């Protein structure tokens, strides 16, 4: 068959390609080495569909995740082979008692310094600001390193007592995260202080720092072994040394073990095993890769002995020694995303240190949030850190806002599809983000996460708009408040009467329909499934049309009209006409729908009640029903629209636990007999009505009173539910 290998772009992929060529020479099987961007993200996406590589290279910390997802084949090396490598490297690639990857090399960050610009590098971080002054005097800077990846800033954060997950009982505690403790705040504050005092730039990334150092523009940098090759080429006289201490304590870099995993879906596990065990993991192969880009302290003893002499490796291992090996537990990716954002926002000043690290601390231990974010990353790779509306006080502590975050993305749309540019709002909170019963009942992997959905919204972008408006977030908060108060889940096709302009302007868009988000795909989390329901602004007439007929139809009609939505159903608040005013004929089709199929509405949430002329199962001779005007206007719909078709109709009260199910003859599951029309299991009431009684009823200013020998009906004009416990 074939061999496809994925390895990160900063690693020695050409040497590996040479090893693959030797494998091809000897075996005849071709080896394709690729280095796609963000491979650690793509692999778990693609591997499930079976279009992943045969081998995947990365630090061990990802592999436990993959392994948990069944994406990695168990490796089966004999003892003889295991003897060649260090036990701790094996430990690093061990997950739930199974080996999920082959260890290649030990990696740790070091202080790299220019000997000519700086013969005596600082032992402490506190020295650097002063040093930067001296260097700036002669047009140079002290320190530049990658600030876009938390990997590089972590050693400083970890120094005074920051940690990822607390290691306890031979295990990691997923509830005890150490990112918002004093040491972390101190370290990150110091970093931010370096930036504030203009000793570093917040936007500094890998290539910038590398350039700066290799061109002798900065005296120091922070990087791993792989970086040396380019420095060697730069002919800069450099030294690799121990990282600076902070508050008298050593920087504690996360030690990573470069490892090779085998795709669970690969049919060439044997080819892979052969290649990995008998070609790569040898002195000559590893030397070749190391020749290309230094691996650091390799896991292979025989080659380890040969390379340990190098003081660079010695330094790597000193720093490694002062640090801790990374956990490989599945939650690490959540940890890294969380800390990545905090460092970025803290450095950019978008957030304070405390706010950022509090947010990271909470978010790392939040799988549902992480899962939704994943889908968002897939949809918008270009916007890693979007602007977010965040509730100051979270709902679990009874802040007013049930949505913890609302993400706002810029969606460029498609000019060819004639779908205009717009803002994409995505809510976080209606689903189970945390799973610790702070807000939602924990239901497990099967069933809905929280209410089982999140809200989305697509708002027409103005050309003059630099940033997305925030009012749709409040709109969503309103919607969410309703959902939590009423316990009513939203589904695609439902309608929502708002009776107010959504942006509270003079807009005619006073109502909403709900549909499936056109891009956001449903997601599986350890706490359940999350679907994404998009909000679509509509006019009162269109709502009435959706009520009288069905949501889906009106939605499609709205799709066929670009200015009212188009295929992706974008909302335009400055829209002045209904679709019926824009295209008269369309009206004809609603009227076409109602006449042939009737109404789609299984039931509705409204102000209503029933009573006698609470607890227990009861049959009743007489009944007294109560409605508001709004729900009352649907009674004609309830009767003709559904009862005539052997269908049921249900009114639920939002205020109470009250419910009324209208039933016709010929329905199934009904306990209502023709002899005993009215019966209730409690607040839930069913009444069976005959078409006969239906027509007379249909034929027959508040209060407006309707009466019969068996029943009385009025139309007229206390309790609060909290959370999803």
């Amino acid at each position: 068959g074939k061999l496809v290998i994925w390895i990160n772009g900063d690693k020695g992929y050409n040497g590996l390609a040479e090893v693959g060529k030797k494998f091809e020479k000897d075996t005849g099987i071709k080896v394709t080495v690729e280095h796609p961007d963000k491979l650690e993200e793509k692999f778990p996406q693609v591997a499930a569909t079976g279009d992943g590589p045969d081998i995947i290279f990365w630090a061990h910390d990802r592999f436990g995740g993959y392994a948990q997802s069944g994406l990695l084949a168990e490796i089966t090396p004999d003892k003889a082979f295991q003897d060649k490598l260090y036990p701790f490297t094996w430990d690093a690639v061990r997950y739930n008692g199974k080996l999920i990857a082959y260890p290649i090399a030990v990696e740790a960050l070091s202080l790299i310094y220019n000997k000519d610009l700086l013969p005596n590098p600082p032992k402490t971080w506190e020295e650097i600001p002063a040093l930067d002054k001296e260097l700036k005097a002669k047009g140079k800077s002290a320190l530049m390193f990658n600030l876009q990846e938390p990997y590089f800033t972590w050693p400083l954060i970890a120094a005074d007592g920051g940690y990822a997950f607390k290691y306890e009982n031979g295990k990691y505690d997923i509830k005890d995260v150490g990112v918002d403790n004093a040491g972390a705040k101190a370290g990150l504050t110091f970093l931010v202080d370096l930036i504030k005092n203009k000793h570093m730039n917040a936007d500094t990334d890998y290539s910038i720092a590398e350039h700066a150092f290799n061109h002798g523009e900065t005296a120091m940098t922070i990087n791993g072994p792989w970086a040396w090759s380019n420095i060697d080429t730069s002919k800069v006289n450099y030294g690799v040394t121990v990282l600076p201490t902070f508050k008298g304590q050593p920087s504690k870099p996360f030690v990573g073990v470069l490892s090779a995993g085998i795709n669970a879906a690969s049919p060439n596990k044997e080819l892979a095993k052969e290649f990995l065990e008998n070609y790569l993991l040898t002195d000559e192969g590893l030397e070749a890769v190391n020749k290309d880009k230094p691996l650091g302290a390799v896991a292979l003893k025989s080659y380890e002995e040969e390379l340990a002499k190098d003081p660079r490796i010695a330094a790597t291992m000193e720093n490694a020694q002062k640090g801790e090996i990374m956990p490989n537990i599945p939650q690490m990716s959540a940890f890294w995303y969380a800390v990545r954002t905090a460092v970025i926002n803290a450095a950019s000043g978008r957030q304070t240190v405390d706010a950022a690290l509090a947010a990271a601390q909470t978010n790392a231990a939040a799988p549902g949030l992480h899962a939704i974010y994943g889908e968002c990353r897939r949809l918008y790779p270009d916007q890693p850190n979007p602007l977010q509306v965040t509730a100051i006080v979270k709902y679990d502590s009874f802040g007013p806002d049930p949505l913890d975050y609302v993400s706002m993305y810029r969606n460029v749309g498609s000019p060819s599809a004639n779908i205009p540019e717009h803002w994409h709002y995505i809510s976080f909170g209606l689903s189970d983000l945390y799973g610790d019963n702070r807000v939602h009942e924990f239901t497990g992997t099967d069933g809905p996460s929280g209410f089982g959905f999140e809200l989305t919204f697509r708002l027409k972008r103005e050309t003059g708009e630099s940033a997305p408006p925030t009012w749709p977030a409040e709109l969503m908060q309103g919607l969410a408040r309703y959902v939590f108060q009423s316990e009513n889940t939203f589904c695609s096709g439902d309608h929502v009467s708002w009776h107010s302009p959504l942006d509270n302007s003079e807009s005619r868009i006073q109502h909403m329909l709900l549909t499936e988000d056109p891009q956001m795909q449903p997601v599986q989390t350890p706490f359940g499934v999350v679907t994404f329901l998009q909000i679509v602004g509509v006019c009162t007439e269109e709502l009435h049309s959706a009520q009288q007929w069905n949501g889906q139809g009106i939605l499609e009609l709205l799709r066929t009209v670009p200015i009212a939505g188009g295929p992706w159903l974008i909302t335009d608040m400055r829209r002045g006409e209904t679709i019926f005013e824009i295209d008269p004929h369309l009206q004809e089709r609603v009227d076409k729908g109602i006449e042939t199929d009737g109404s789609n509405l299984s039931g509705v949430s409204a102000k209503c009640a029933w009573d006698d002329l609470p607890i227990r199962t009861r049959q009743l001779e007489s009944v007294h029903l109560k409605f508001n005007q709004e729900s009352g206007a649907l009674i004609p719909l309830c009767l003709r629209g559904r009862l005539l078709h052997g269908r049921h109709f249900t009114y639920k009260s939002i205020t109470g636990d009250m419910a009324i199910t209208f039933v016709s003859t010929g329905v199934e599951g009904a306990f209502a007999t023709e002899e005993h029309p009215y019966a209730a299991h409690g607040p839930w009431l069913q009444i069976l009505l005959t078409e006969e009684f239906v027509e007379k009823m249909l034929e027959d200013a508040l209060p407006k009173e309707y009466s019969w020998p068996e029943k009385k009906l009025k139309v007229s004009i206390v309790e609060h539910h909290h959370h999803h416990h």
Binding site: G478, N488, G493, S605, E630
Partner: peptide
Amino acid sequence: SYGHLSIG
């Protein structure tokens, strides 16, 4: 298939 009225 379901309606929610005057939620706001």
